[PDB]
Every structure is written in C-alpha cells, then in structure tokens.
Amino acid sequence: ASDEKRIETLISEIKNMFRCMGYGETNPSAYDTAWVARIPAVDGSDNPHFPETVEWILQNQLKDGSWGEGFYFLAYDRILATLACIITLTLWRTGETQVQKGIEFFRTQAGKMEDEADSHRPSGFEIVFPAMLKEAKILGLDLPYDLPFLKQIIEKREAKLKRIPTDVLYALPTTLLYSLEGLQEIVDWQKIMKLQSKDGSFLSSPASTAAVFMRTGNKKCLDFLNFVLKKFGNHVPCHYPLDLFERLWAVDTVERLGIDRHFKEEIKEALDYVYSHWDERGIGWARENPVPDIDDTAMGLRILRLHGYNVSSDVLKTFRDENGEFFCFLGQTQRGVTDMLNVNRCSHVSFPGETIMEEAKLCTERYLRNALENVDAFDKWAFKKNIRGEVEYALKYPWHKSMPRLEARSYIENYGPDDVWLGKTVYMMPYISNEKYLELAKLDFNKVQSIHQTELQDLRRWWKSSGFTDLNFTRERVTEIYFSPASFIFEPEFSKCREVYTKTSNFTVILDDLYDAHGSLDDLKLFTESVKRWDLSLVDQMPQQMKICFVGFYNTFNDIAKEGRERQGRDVLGYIQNVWKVQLEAYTKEAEWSEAKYVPSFNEYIENASVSIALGTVVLISALFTGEVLTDEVLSKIDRESRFLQLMGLTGRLVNDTKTYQAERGQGEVASAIQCYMKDHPKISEEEALQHVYSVMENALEELNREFVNNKIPDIYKRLVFETARIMQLFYMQGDSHDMEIKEHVKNCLFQPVA
C-alpha cells in the first residue's frame, strides 16, 4: 500500500468524520458524570435516577485509584474527579472498594500539589473543588483536610464568594453559571432560573444543570440531561453540545494544514450548518448558546466570510469594552493567547470602513506581542503543542503576506495531533485533534513538493535551451520566480499554469531590465514594433543583446500561443499581443520619463507604474491555462479595465516602491511613489510621505479583500489575482538579511520536505 493509497484511505476516513459530525464528539467527564449520578430517582424510590451513570463510575476508575482522563494526566483533573466520584458512591452506599482506592489516591495526590503549581487550573476549580471538600467533611470522609493546600483553597474560595458581584451574576447569563454546583450555598435560585439556556442547560454544563435540578426540580434541566445521555448513553461530558465549535475547528484545521481541497463538499455541508445558526450578536460553541464567545465568533466570522457567507464584523462589537480592548466574554476581563490569536487572524480579513476590525487588530497585536515575552515554545504545561509558533507566524506573516504552502508548512510543524483541552475538566476533541489530519497533511505536502521539484527542473532546462544565459543585463533566477506560483497555485492540476506564470514573469523581469537599461529609446521602439507586427522583420536592426532577447520572447510566446489556442478553442495570439502591447507601452513611458529625467505627479506616476510593475500581464496570460475556457464575461472581471486587477497592480507597485526606493533613489531613477508624492507636497516631511504611501497601500489591500471575497468570479482567477498581490507583499515586506529571507522561503516550499 503505497503513500498514494494511504492518501486515498485517509481522505475517505476524514470525509466520514465530517459526515458523522453531529452535536459533538468528546470524552466522558468523570466529574460531571458523578454529579448526574447524584440525582435521586424521580419516583421517590431509593435509587439514582440514572443508574447507568453510577455503574459507569464503578467501571471507570483508573489503576492508581483516581478517576479522570487517563490519556492525559493533570493533577487538578484527577483530584477533582476522584473527590466527586467518592462523594457520589458514598451517597449511594456503593462501591466500597473503589471509594477506598479513591481515598488513597486523593491522599497521595493531595500531598504533591506543590509540584503541579505551574500546571493550568481547570475552569472553576477554585469554586467547585472546595465546595466538595466541605461536603466530604460533613460526610466524614477521611481526607488530609489539614494539608496547607486543601485548608487554604477552602479559605480562598470563601474570600472569592463574598467578592462576587450579585448584579452581574443575575443580570445576564455568565460563565459563573458554568459552575453553579459550587455556588449552591450563596445563590438565589429563582433569579438563576431566568438565565437557563434554551435547551434547559446552565451554560452547557451537565454538573451545573444537575445541581440546579436537585435544588429546584426544574424539568427542562432534566430534558437537557436526557438529551446529553441520548448521545452518550451512560455518561456525560463537561459541556454539551459542541456542534459549532467542532465544525469550525475541523474546517480551520484542514484549511491551515493545506489539505482542504480534498473536502470541499464536506466543508460546504459543515459551514451551511454553522451559518444556519449564525447570530448577529456572535455565537458560542453550541447552537443557540446562552452567551457567545469571541473565539467561536472570530473563527466563524473569518471562515464564513472567506467562504462567501453574508456575515458582518458587527458580531465583534459584543466583545469590545468602552476602551477598545477585546475580551472572550461580554462583561468580563478574561482572554488568552489562543483566543486573541484567532481574533487577530480574523481582524486582517477586513473590508473598507470596518473600524471594529482595525481595533481588533491593534488590541490583539499588543496582547500577543506582550505574551510572547512570557510564553515559551513547546511549553510542557500548555495544552497546545506550540502556540508560540502559531503566534510568531501569525504576527510576522499576516493575511496579506501568508502564502498557502508557507502557512501549511508552518502549521504542519506546530499542529498537535494529540492535544487535549481544558474546561471544567480535561477533555478531548477527536475531530479537531487527530493523527489522521497531520498524517495526510505531511503525505500530501511532500507529494506536491515532489511534483514541484520536477517542474522546476523542466523550467531550468527551458532557460538554458533559450540561450538566455547570454543576456548580461539581467540576473537569472528561475527558482526564485517559480517559487511564487508554486507557493499558492500548488495543485498538480495547475502545472501548466505554473509553467506559463513562471515564463511570463521571467520575461517581465528581462524586459523590465531591457527597457530600463537606459539604452536608446529608438532601439526599444524596434522591440515594441516587433511585438506589434509579430515577425522577425526588425531583428537585423537590433543591438546584440536585444536581438537575442526578442527571438527568445517570440519563440516562447508562439509556443504559449499554440498551447493556449488549443485550450481556449480559438486563436489567442491577438490577446497575448494586446496584453504585451499595454505592458511595453507602460515600460516605454517610464523610459522616456527617465531619459528626460521627468518626475510626474503621484496620480500620473501611479497610473502608469501600477501597470509597469507587470503583475497584470502575468495574470492575463496565465489565466488562459487554468483548465477551463476563459469566457469574455470572466475575462472582463479580471482584465485591465477591472478594479480587481487594478488594485493588485497598485498594491504591488507601492510595496515595491516603499522598499526599493531606498537604494534606487541613489542608483538614478528619481521617479517613484515616494519621490513623486514628495513633489506634489514639498510642504511635507519625508517620513510623513513614506507613511502616507503605506496608508494608501493598506486601504487598497482592504479594498482588494472585498473584491477577492465578494466578486462573483471563478475561484481560480481570484487566487491568481489576489495571491499575486500577496507574493509582492511577502517579497517586499517591512523587514526590520533581506535576500536571506527569500532563500528561506524557497527552501521551505520547494526543497526541505515536512516530516
């Protein structure tokens, strides 16, 4: 069974996972199950109302005497679950031996809590754990109550309860409701009932709902427990359902790992579901959740937006405070690296005028950067394999600078296939953290990279066979150029588009140097004229170097024209000539301005420079080789007259200029974005200019997002336009050497395989 069969296997297995998604897949919560097991039979009989949960407890104690998730050891988790189970078995006068083994484990573990201090405290631990300690004491259980840890956590809980703001606690549903089982002595049940969830739960917590039921007999509470038990039979998780959380994270996982193309139909079915549950105030982890959270809302906002759904960034307003800081829940100060990170990724995919997204970007940036000072890579205590790596990548390579292969490689190395999650207890999400996603991501990434190494070879032979080794006015760089399309339109099906993209880009570089060689304009005119009549009637009047350049140009494009005519069902030479006609004209205007040392105004310069940068040319010629006939209607949406292509050219030109103007300002050319802006405003500071140009670029990138997302154009053409702009943002990104960075990208995408 070769790696190709394995790939097929993994794909069908992962497709089944998506088809199986319902209310959520997770592990049992011994702690919550213990609480459900406490509910006495409704008929007044002396039996648990859910006998199966008591039996579950009896059958699932671990070898060391504790209860909890065996897969991953967390001290807090084990002592929490053990105490909870011991109390429940004691109440039912059953499992005498298990209770004894549990007591012993609890006692041994209770005395070692000082070496687990660096571990993370489970949600509501300090509220729920001491509350049971007091129960245990009343029942006379033999526990090391005098141990500092246990004696002091009870005292701290007491000082925490008397410090809770009654108003907030009863005004709206809050995460405090997630642990009502630990607030049973200080809560006004009647006021609490008004904050019940639509499905009858209290913030989706089974133990919390069980406690409320035992105190009020409220029937909807029972309906929620029956509903949870309908799914799990004889036990419950620490929160349910998890339908929105599971679907959004599964989709984000396969996209970030770069294997999403294999599940378009599944991702479609999952997102339709999430959207049918979309709420303008934001969403939670479960359909119709009592309270939304910034993490699920930010995830959903970005992914639903990128997939064409009509969602608004207004959903984030729910998490913004009067000062512009964002938190995970309305009315709370809680937030963490993981959620600020997903919020940060989301804030970059904004449209013009979305002030909230800009504020989210600023807040998350300051918070993530301040966090990378106190967080270590691969921290042995964190539940994520390497959040620091995800942060570092997200901050250095944001949306507009992140190419698919590079992001996929990054996540492939930071993704933890066996990460656990921390809630009221330690829980696992089989459809988010799975060895199969990662296995497929690696096999697929190397299979693709292998195909790319072949293509690269065949491009390097084209360069040598064209004798371009003769050209002395331009530095050879097929690899560097091939990296670009390879980084975004990587699929094996687009090999031809990659080839033509590479050759066309290389020619825009060669001709760019030719027209900027400061030679004679009369000579350049022969090249332009040759392209117009498309023959070799002027090759004899051409300088040595130019002649070679053109012959190569002519031979290469007659080839592309032929293959293009066959894939388009019509002659494409006229099309190719017109594409180049405008490109050469743009080069010609710069050359004339150069020889005359003219510095046009900003507007005039940018209009020509947006074209001279040549990104449009690369796109228009590559668009003939996608695999589908390019109709006149599709073309009109990406041609030189479209706002979409114009913005791509504009952003490419500006990023290139804000950077290179540095050295070229002394190399000669005095006409550039910055230089020209300064000429239109001599009453302006140099720095103020560079910055202004960064502002224009940014608004343009923001407008480009909206085009990329909202324009009804076949996906492949939107990628060709949008990714080409990104490649420029990456190559000319704000640094802080330079060419060393490129070297690294080339290595990560084309040579070093993932293991």
Side-chain angles (χ1 to χ4, degrees):
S2 60
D3 293 314
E4 186 65 15
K5 176 191 175 183
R6 180 53 169 163
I7 287 176
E8 184 161 54
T9 300
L10 286 165
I11 294 181
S12 66
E13 286 180 350
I14 290 175
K15 280 188 175 183
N16 189 65
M17 267 175 63
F18 275 84
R19 298 189 60 180
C20 284
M21 272 165 219
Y23 286 114
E25 286 304 311
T26 183
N27 64 318
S29 174
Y31 167 81
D32 288 80
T33 302
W35 275 92
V36 171
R38 288 199 195 186
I39 312 172
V42 173
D43 61 298
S45 170
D46 170 50
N47 303 107
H49 184 67
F50 298 112
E52 74 261 40
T53 63
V54 170
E55 183 67 23
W56 184 87
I57 296 169
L58 296 173
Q59 311 278 59
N60 283 277
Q61 180 178 43
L62 304 178
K63 290 183 178 180
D64 63 1
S66 69
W67 274 274
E69 191 40 272
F71 180 80
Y72 185 92
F73 183 92
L74 184 67
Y76 292 124
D77 180 66
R78 298 305 178 70
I79 58 174
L80 175 75
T82 305
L83 180 53
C85 292
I86 284 172
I87 291 176
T88 302
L89 297 183
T90 294
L91 295 179
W92 288 120
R93 315 160 221 63
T94 187
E96 281 79 6
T97 65
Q98 292 97 321
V99 167
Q100 188 45 39
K101 285 178 180 181
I103 284 182
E104 309 184 328
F105 170 82
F106 177 101
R107 169 161 51 247
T108 306
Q109 183 60 66
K112 300 187 298 187
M113 293 311 289
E114 300 185 303
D115 201 348
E116 310 291 288
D118 280 46
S119 70
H120 306 305
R121 254 180 169 66
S123 305
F125 187 81
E126 294 183 295
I127 279 179
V128 161
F129 186 66
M132 290 193 298
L133 276 180
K134 299 175 70 172
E135 300 192 76
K137 191 167 186 177
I138 297 294
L139 289 178
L141 296 181
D142 185 41
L143 301 178
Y145 301 117
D146 295 312
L147 279 182
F149 176 72
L150 297 177
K151 183 193 173 186
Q152 283 157 40
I153 200 172
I154 289 172
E155 177 186 358
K156 186 181 178 181
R157 167 179 178 282
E158 210 75 17
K160 191 173 180 181
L161 265 37
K162 297 179 181 177
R163 192 170 53 193
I164 288 176
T166 297
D167 317 297
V168 185
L169 187 277
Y170 300 118
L172 310 172
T174 65
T175 60
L176 279 165
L177 300 177
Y178 184 63
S179 23
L180 285 167
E181 70 269 26
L183 307 163
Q184 303 182 65
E185 317 105 301
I186 77 174
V187 83
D188 180 328
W189 294 117
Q190 170 175 55
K191 291 187 173 183
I192 290 300
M193 299 306 319
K194 310 185 189 186
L195 307 179
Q196 177 170 49
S197 310
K198 285 176 38 47
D199 64 19
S201 89
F202 278 87
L203 235 110
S204 80
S205 170
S208 200
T209 301
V212 175
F213 175 77
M214 288 193 283
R215 283 313 181 73
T216 71
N218 177 277
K219 299 160 184 174
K220 289 205 65 178
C221 288
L222 209 64
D223 299 329
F224 174 73
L225 298 179
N226 287 321
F227 163 88
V228 169
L229 285 171
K230 175 172 62 65
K231 200 299 185 301
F232 307 98
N234 62 348
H235 63 273
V236 306
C238 60
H239 43 207
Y240 215 63
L242 302 173
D243 55 335
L244 306 192
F245 167 46
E246 181 167 76
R247 285 176 175 72
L248 289 169
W249 262 248
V251 165
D252 187 53
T253 299
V254 297
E255 294 189 309
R256 295 179 80 184
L257 284 177
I259 54 177
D260 62 296
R261 72 180 186 286
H262 302 298
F263 319 101
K264 294 198 291 295
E265 296 169 289
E266 292 59 51
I267 293 177
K268 208 276 185 179
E269 209 175 72
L271 294 180
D272 282 337
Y273 179 91
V274 176
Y275 182 66
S276 74
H277 288 293
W278 193 250
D279 190 302
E280 294 180 295
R281 310 184 311 290
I283 58 174
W285 47 91
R287 50 92 188 81
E288 350 293 66
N289 208 61
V291 308
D293 69 285
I294 205 172
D295 207 1
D296 287 276
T297 299
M299 267 286 111
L301 172 54
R302 183 177 49 88
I303 297 178
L304 289 175
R305 162 163 288 182
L306 289 174
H307 286 258
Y309 291 92
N310 178 25
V311 291
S312 167
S313 58
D314 292 326
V315 292
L316 296 182
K317 281 174 165 57
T318 295
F319 308 92
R320 178 188 188 277
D321 72 6
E322 311 302 303
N323 299 297
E325 289 308 304
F326 294 72
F327 300 95
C328 202
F329 296 96
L330 177 158
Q332 288 183 44
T333 301
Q334 183 196 308
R335 64 180 171 181
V337 178
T338 297
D339 48 296
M340 286 303 88
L341 172 56
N342 291 316
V343 169
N344 176 276
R345 293 168 68 205
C346 172
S347 71
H348 285 280
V349 192
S350 60
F351 299 161
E354 301 192 313
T355 298
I356 190 68
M357 294 289 260
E358 189 187 314
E359 307 184 305
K361 178 194 292 181
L362 297 177
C363 166
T364 57
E365 266 194 289
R366 284 185 283 80
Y367 176 100
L368 288 177
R369 286 185 180 296
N370 189 65
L372 287 178
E373 297 295 65
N374 306 300
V375 186
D376 307 303
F378 310 95
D379 184 292
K380 70 170 189 174
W381 297 108
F383 288 59
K384 286 283 190 174
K385 177 179 176 178
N386 185 29
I387 199 62
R388 188 194 181 71
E390 289 181 54
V391 174
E392 278 182 355
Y393 181 78
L395 285 179
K396 192 177 181 181
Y397 300 112
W399 176 236
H400 296 140
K401 301 182 186 181
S402 182
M403 316 307 306
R405 291 289 84 183
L406 297 179
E407 182 173 309
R409 192 175 205 296
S410 186
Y411 201 52
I412 284 183
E413 297 180 307
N414 294 304
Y415 178 63
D418 47 19
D419 286 323
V420 283
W421 306 69
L422 191 54
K424 177 71 64 59
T425 68
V426 169
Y427 65 103
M428 317 176 315
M429 228 72 64
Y431 298 171
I432 303 176
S433 298
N434 185 297
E435 295 276 2
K436 294 182 176 173
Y437 291 145
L438 186 54
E439 182 178 3
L440 178 59
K442 293 184 174 176
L443 286 170
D444 193 53
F445 184 97
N446 293 327
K447 169 191 172 187
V448 176
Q449 181 188 65
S450 179
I451 292 175
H452 285 175
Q453 299 175 313
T454 295
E455 296 180 0
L456 180 59
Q457 289 305 68
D458 293 305
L459 276 174
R460 282 172 175 169
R461 295 189 186 73
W462 157 75
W463 173 274
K464 294 176 182 174
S465 300
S466 292
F468 289 139
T469 314
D470 299 340
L471 307 179
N472 53 55
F473 57 93
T474 186
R475 46 150 299 190
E476 180 279 353
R477 43 188 162 191
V478 176
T479 301
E480 185 173 297
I481 290 180
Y482 176 67
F483 157 72
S484 294
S487 81
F488 65 82
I489 49 167
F490 57 90
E491 298 87 320
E493 313 104 72
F494 303 119
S495 50
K496 198 61 186 178
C497 184
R498 284 197 284 286
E499 181 202 310
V500 181
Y501 188 115
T502 300
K503 284 170 183 174
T504 311
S505 297
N506 217 307
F507 263 104
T508 60
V509 164
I510 291 174
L511 297 186
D512 190 10
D513 294 325
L514 190 66
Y515 281 65
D516 183 51
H518 290 162
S520 88
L521 292 165
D522 288 326
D523 283 350
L524 294 182
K525 188 188 171 306
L526 300 173
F527 198 100
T528 304
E529 175 76 305
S530 296
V531 180
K532 181 195 178 186
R533 54 175 74 169
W534 197 260
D535 62 41
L536 305 179
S537 63
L538 301 181
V539 167
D540 288 338
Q541 303 175 54
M542 285 182 194
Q544 174 62 187
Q545 296 291 289
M546 189 173 135
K547 179 180 173 184
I548 291 174
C549 173
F550 185 71
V551 174
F553 180 79
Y554 176 83
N555 294 333
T556 291
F557 287 92
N558 270 330
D559 179 359
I560 285 174
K562 177 182 175 185
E563 292 189 296
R565 175 173 60 265
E566 301 166 8
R567 305 180 65 137
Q568 290 306 317
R570 64 176 171 70
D571 187 53
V572 302
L573 186 50
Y575 173 84
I576 293 187
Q577 298 180 204
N578 190 242
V579 170
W580 279 108
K581 170 186 172 59
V582 177
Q583 186 63 57
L584 301 185
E585 263 156 42
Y587 289 146
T588 297
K589 195 183 294 289
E590 301 201 325
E592 299 174 321
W593 285 340
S594 192
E595 94 76 54
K597 291 188 177 183
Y598 181 62
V599 177
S601 70
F602 184 72
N603 280 52
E604 177 168 56
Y605 171 80
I606 266 302
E607 288 310 309
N608 185 69
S610 296
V611 174
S612 75
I613 193 60
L615 302 181
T617 292
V618 182
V619 170
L620 295 177
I621 300 187
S622 296
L624 280 38
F625 305 78
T626 59
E628 294 306 310
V629 174
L630 176 60
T631 67
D632 290 314
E633 184 61 9
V634 173
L635 175 58
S636 70
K637 292 180 172 60
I638 63 168
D639 66 32
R640 299 195 183 284
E641 273 53 59
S642 73
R643 176 66 174 170
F644 194 24
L645 198 81
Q646 297 175 333
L647 279 170
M648 170 198 72
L650 178 59
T651 63
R653 179 85 250 166
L654 300 186
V655 72
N656 181 294
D657 273 30
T658 56
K659 194 79 170 185
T660 62
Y661 111 107
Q662 193 78 301
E664 295 191 61
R665 167 191 54 192
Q667 302 181 188
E669 305 179 63
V670 191
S672 74
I674 296 68
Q675 297 178 294
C676 292
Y677 190 64
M678 291 177 92
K679 202 205 65 174
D680 293 311
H681 306 74
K683 191 183 65 178
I684 279 299
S685 50
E686 189 299 301
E687 183 276 357
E688 195 77 302
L690 184 61
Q691 170 168 49
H692 172 260
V693 171
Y694 282 142
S695 191
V696 177
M697 189 184 88
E698 291 304 309
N699 296 314
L701 279 169
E702 201 154 52
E703 181 169 351
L704 187 59
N705 281 328
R706 191 173 54 188
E707 300 296 305
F708 174 67
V709 172
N710 297 340
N711 295 345
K712 301 175 183 179
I713 304 169
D715 199 61
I716 184 64
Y717 303 104
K718 294 205 287 181
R719 292 170 59 191
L720 278 174
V721 177
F722 193 71
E723 296 303 320
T724 290
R726 302 173 93 177
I727 275 299
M728 291 295 285
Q729 287 303 316
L730 179 65
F731 283 4
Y732 300 99
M733 65 183 287
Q734 187 63 63
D736 59 350
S737 176
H738 179 294
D739 301 2
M740 188 62 86
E741 282 283 49
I742 295 73
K743 184 72 176 179
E744 179 64 40
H745 299 153
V746 166
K747 187 183 65 180
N748 290 313
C749 179
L750 308 177
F751 305 128
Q752 203 112 61
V754 298

